[PDB]
Structure formats: C-alpha cells, structure tokens
Structure 1
Amino acid sequence: EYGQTQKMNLFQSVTSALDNSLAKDPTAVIFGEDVAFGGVFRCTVGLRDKYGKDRVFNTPLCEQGIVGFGIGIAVTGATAIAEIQFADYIFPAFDQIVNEAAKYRYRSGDLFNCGSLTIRSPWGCVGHGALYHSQSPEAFFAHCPGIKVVIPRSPFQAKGLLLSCIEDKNPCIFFEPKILYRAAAEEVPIEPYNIPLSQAEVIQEGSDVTLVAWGTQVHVIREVASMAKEKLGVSCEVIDLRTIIPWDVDTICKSVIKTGRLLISHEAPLTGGFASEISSTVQEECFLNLEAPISRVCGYDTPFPHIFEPFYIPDKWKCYDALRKMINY
C-alpha cells in the first residue's frame, strides 16, 4: 500500500517523519531544547549529522522564545518544526500560541501567516511522571480557533499524522504519547505518506455502543470492547478521534446514530476536558437516537499525582464499569 516498511516504535517513526520532511523540504528546520544530540526521547537522533547544524539545533531554555522564534521562521514561509520538551512545559508559550500563532492569518487578512509552523511535544501519562511529566493539555488548546491539535495512537499513525501537520498550511500542535515511544514496534513505511487531519478512524465496527478516545487511551478502549464482548455480549464500535480540533463531528455522529450510546474517555481531567465538547455536540446532533446519557470516563479533577497514578487514570476497569452501567441504564 505504501512501499517498503520497517518495524519502528513511536520515537523511530517520529525520526522517520522528520527525516522525510528535511529531505524533501530544503526550508525545514528543527529546534528546541536538547534536540541537537538527538533529544531526551531520541526523536531527533542522527538528524543534525545528516542535515547540518543550521537545520537541527538547540535553543536557549525558554519556551516562550521557542514558539515565538518558530512563528518568525514560519512568517518567512520556511517550515519550522519546534519541540517543547514535555507538554507540561508548553504553558510559558501559551500567549505565543493562542494570541499570536492561532490569530496570525486572520488578523492580517491573510497578508501574513505562520502556517508552516508545527510544535511537537511528548504528552500523557508515563507511570511515574507526576504533576509535570504526565499532562494532557489538549482541552486548553481546543478553545483556540486557528490552531490544529493532533494526537496519534501508534507509530504508523504518528508518522502519517506528523507529516500531515508539517505540510498543513496552519500552525499545528502534535502531541506524541510518550509512554508509547519505546512500546511495541509496528511496520511503518520508510517513504513519506500522509494521514488526513480532522478525520477520526473507526478501528473496530460495532452495533451497541460507540467508544471514543485518542492517544494511548485508544488501546484502553480497544481492550474494553473486548471485555464487553466477552463478559456482556456487547458489540462496541471503537473510534480513534486523532484530531482534537478541528474535530471529525460527522464520523462520531454517524456512529452514535447507529449505536444509540456513547462513552468518551481521556486521561485529562473531566472538568472542561475535551469529552465535554464531544458530548455536548453529539447530544445536539443525535438527541433522538440516545438510549442512555453519554458517559465521560476521564482523569479526576486534580493535578496528576506521583504515587497515586494507578488510582488516577481512567483505566480499562473504570471504562468497563461505566460501560456496564450505561448498557443497563
């Protein structure tokens, strides 16, 4: 389908996407903290040697600077691939992302833009990351028209989605689930290929209930589907959202019109979490089809704890129990 493949874990698939990008786009540069020696999660190994120190380089330790600097590169039309070392540390750049990058094209009447910016950042829980190496900030960014927010669930998906982000003519934030960096490998095409943005993927068809998640949590809901089938004889339709904004309203609504039930799950805290936007939209569009209340199985409304992580996360049991109750409603 896509030419020769090799087994790659998620960090390798990121390197491959970045390599493909710099090979085909002579404007493209990669920068951030500690990117030059290959990055703290290895995502840029070999790239400075292959493409040159003027193209893969370290910045000072200043996230607001990293994003402002990336916006400026993109204003000249050059492809700027910025790294933020953990998603938890994207906040100092919030004003540059929200007030500047997201608004740049609109506010200038399209005289200027920063479409050729992509910000990539490790994201989500990692077992022991605690408050500042665990966060999933996508809902903060979801309320900001003018940026795209994209989160893959695997190495094949990561390379295709990241290539799309890099090439998309809008500033994109690409969140890489860091617990998957060295998890299982899968076959990934060596040459470039794209997966469309704003398109959810139905990974398993079903008829009784729709399950929606993104990132690592897709694997959790896949397992929940299996538990529901085996233990309850319930047929689950499993959907990976992939793009947080602009999101694929049509695919989710079509599924819920068919099943009549929806459960959305994410690691991020419940309140103001992106599940609230999906839930309220699906309720508006599929109201007459809803057999039970749409359920949200999310992280608790606390900071992300160190020793308590096993009790914090919306794991397969929490999702399964919510599902069981919804099936019984």
Structure 2
Amino acid sequence: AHFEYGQTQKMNLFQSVTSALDNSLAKDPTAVIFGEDVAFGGVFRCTVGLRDKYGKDRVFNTPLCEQGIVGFGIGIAVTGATAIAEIQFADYIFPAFDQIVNEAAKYRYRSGDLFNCGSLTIRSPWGCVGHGALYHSQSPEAFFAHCPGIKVVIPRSPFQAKGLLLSCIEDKNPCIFFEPKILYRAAAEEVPIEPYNIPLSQAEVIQEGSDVTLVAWGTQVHVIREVASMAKEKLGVSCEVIDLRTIIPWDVDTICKSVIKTGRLLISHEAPLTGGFASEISSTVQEECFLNLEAPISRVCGYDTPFPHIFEPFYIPDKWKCYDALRKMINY
C-alpha cells in the first residue's frame, strides 16, 4: 500500500457510510437511496442491510443509466424529499455531467428560488485503488469545482466520512460526496453510532507546524501526514498538515491563515496537475498571501495522462514525490 458524541464502535469507511445512511433513513421519512446494485448492499457493501430494514420502496435499484439516476434524483428533490443517489464509480459520473452542471447546480438560481434540488446528494467511490486503471481510479473533483451551485466533499477517514456525509444529506444544496474507495476496508476507527455532523466548507488542521503548510484531501491526507514525519526526522522541518475536506465552496481562510504563518505551501492531489484543484488553491493563496511567500507554491499531482494500469506505482504523487518537492521548496 502507498499510504463526546456518545457510544462509538470501530468502523471502516464502508461501514461508516452505511451508518450515516441508516441514521438518515431513520430520522428522515422522506429519504430514499437508489442507483445501480444498491438493493443487495452495493458493490462496495455501503448499503448492506438497508433495504431489509427500511423497505424496497426506499432502497432500490435503478436501470443502468447514470444520466437517468441523477435526473431522477433531482426530480425527487424538487418535491422536497431527500434523494441519496449512488454513482457506482466516480469514473462513470460523466454521463450525468449535464444533469449535474446544467440542471442540479442551476436549479435554485434560475428559478428565483421557486424550485430547488437542495435535498439531493450524489455519493460515489473515488480515487486510486492500486490497479483500477483508467476507469476505476479517477478523481473528478476539479471538473465539478468550476460549477457554481454544487458542493463537492471528500473525507479522509471513517469518522470524517460519516459526519461529512450526514452534513451533505442535510445541506440545502445539491452535494457530491466522493468516498475514497481504497479506504473502504482499510483500518477501522471509532465512529459514533448516533448521528453527528462535521461542517462543510471547513478545512481541518490535523497537525500544527511552523515551516511549511501541506494541503491535501481524501487518502492523500495520509500521504502528506507521513511526509510531515519524514520532513521532521530528515530535515528538522515543522509541517502544518491540513485536510481541505470541502472542494467547493472551499475554506480559503484556514488555508491563508496557515500560509501567512509558515510562508510556504505544498498542495498535493491524485488528480492530474493541469486544471486540477491545486491550481485554484495556489492562485488564491498567491493573491492573498503574496507578501508572505518565501518560495513558490508547489503542486505535487498526478501526471497529465489517463490513469494507467501497470504503471500506477509510478503515476501517483506518493510520499517520496511529495517529500522531494518539499525538500526543494525548503531550499529554494
């Protein structure tokens, strides 16, 4: 491999998603969950047990048609009912791109708030998985970041996923929630059994530091956490490690406060460099923190290619690529 709320149980990230979805359907009688193969529990087990517990009218399979899944979910949401759609892999969200960008995101604005689809959430497995190649590995968040009117949220762990997913389900705006699939059965951690929320549009500083700010999201947060340890041990460099969590609208303030303190920023993501979301963060930090920058802002990202099968170990922005970029930046 490359990497206070009442009673808790150890849960992995798939189980935390099921727990959020169960909590949601228990407390919101309007809520339904649908998509390809969700009825028997889903191809990643995220919906196991839910049809039996809540009913076939509430957890159900659709035909194999992503533009239809999203259009259908928007329509449920237009009536005010909570619609939690699944897209089986994020790589297959593109058929629904028109329904998400031209319809869901613009629904409230274009009607003057006469109609909306706020009660829609789209959840989808995301990110690399060791061998997923072109169509089981993608990280599409930058495509969606250029669309005003949708929120895009990516957790780093089981505790984070349940609280962020509950926030998306209850937020009054259409949300895309990307679940890093390489974490679904990775290590468990303690997760509250009852519902709780983690705010959207709020980054989390998970380790304080004074020399350099590192920003990432999803599995890549664990990579940068390890890079921070490498930099401390090998270079005596103190890294502030930040999980962005929400891609849009993003927490500009937390990131800029950190970079004003440290004077250095490295942003990392699995998605390709060009047009990737690191570009938005870099250009914004530059505008707001210009006088504080000791070295150019570094982006350590996937290469500008499709995501390869046999070459995945060479493609990803792993801890050595991040560390090497950090070393150069520290010495700039």
The TM-score range, normalised by the shorter chain, is over 0.9
Distance in 1, Cα, partners of 2:316 & 2:73:
34
Q: Give the Å deviation of 1:297.
A: 0.0
Q: Give the Å deviation of 1:101.
A: 0.0
- Tell me the secondary structure at the aligned position of residue 271 of structure 2: strand
Distance in 1, Cα, partners of 2:129 & 2:38:
21
Q: Give the Å deviation of 1:223.
A: 0.0
- Tell me the secondary structure at the aligned position of residue 275 of structure 1: helix
Which residue number in structure 2 is paired with residue 70 of structure 1? 73
Q: Give the Å deviation of 1:20.
A: 0.0
Distance in 2, Cα, partners of 1:139 & 1:309:
20
Q: Give the Å deviation of 1:104.
A: 0.0
Which ranges in structure 2 are unaligned for 5 or more consecutive residues?
A: none
Which residue number in structure 2 is paired with residue 222 of structure 1? 225
- Tell me the secondary structure at the aligned position of residue 183 of structure 1: coil
Give per-residue Cα distances to partners, 1:161-192, cap 9 Å, x unaligned: 00000000000000000000000000000000
Q: Give the Å deviation of 1:95.
A: 0.1
Give per-residue Cα distances to partners, 1:70-103, cap 9 Å, x unaligned: 0000000000000000000000000000000000
Give per-residue Cα distances to partners, 1:241-297, cap 9 Å, x unaligned: 000000000000000000000000000000000000000000000000000000000
Q: Give the Å deviation of 1:202.
A: 0.1
Q: Give the Å deviation of 1:141.
A: 0.0
Give per-residue Cα distances to partners, 1:40-63, cap 9 Å, x unaligned: 000000000000000000000000
Q: Give the Å deviation of 1:21.
A: 0.0
- Tell me the secondary structure at the aligned position of residue 118 of structure 2: coil
Distance in 2, Cα, partners of 1:97 & 1:317:
36
Which residue number in structure 1 is paired with residue 160 of structure 2? 157
Q: Give the Å deviation of 1:228.
A: 0.0
Distance in 2, Cα, partners of 1:299 & 1:240:
18
Give per-residue Cα distances to partners, 1:296-320, cap 9 Å, x unaligned: 0000000000000000000000000
- Tell me the secondary structure at the aligned position of residue 166 of structure 1: helix
Distance in 2, Cα, partners of 1:248 & 1:63:
30
Distance in 1, Cα, partners of 2:296 & 2:253:
20
Q: Which of 316, 322, 326 is the aligned partner of 2:325?
A: 322
Q: Give the Å deviation of 1:34.
A: 0.1
Give per-residue Cα distances to partners, 1:26-50, cap 9 Å, x unaligned: 0000000000000000000000000
- Tell me the secondary structure at the aligned position of residue 207 of structure 1: coil
Q: Give the Å deviation of 1:328.
A: 0.1
Q: Give the Å deviation of 1:12.
A: 0.1
Instruction: Give the root-mean-square deviation of aligned CA atoms.
Output: 0.1
Q: Give the Å deviation of 1:234.
A: 0.0
Q: Give the Å deviation of 1:215.
A: 0.1
Q: Give the Å deviation of 1:325.
A: 0.1
Relative to the length of structure 1, the TM-score reads: 1.00
Q: Does 1:194 align with 2:173?
A: no
Q: Give the Å deviation of 1:160.
A: 0.1
Give per-residue Cα distances to partners, 1:192-222, cap 9 Å, x unaligned: 0000000000000000000000000000000
- Tell me the secondary structure at the aligned position of residue 161 of structure 2: helix
Q: Give the Å deviation of 1:109.
A: 0.1
Which residue number in structure 1 is paired with residue 136 of structure 2? 133
Q: Give the Å deviation of 1:126.
A: 0.0
Distance in 2, Cα, partners of 1:100 & 1:38:
29
Q: Does 1:115 align with 2:118?
A: yes
Which residue number in structure 2 is paired with residue 46 of structure 1? 49
Distance in 2, Cα, partners of 1:311 & 1:150:
27
When the two structures are aligned, how many residues end up with a matched partner?
Answer: 329
- Tell me the secondary structure at the aligned position of residue 81 of structure 2: coil
Q: Give the Å deviation of 1:13.
A: 0.1
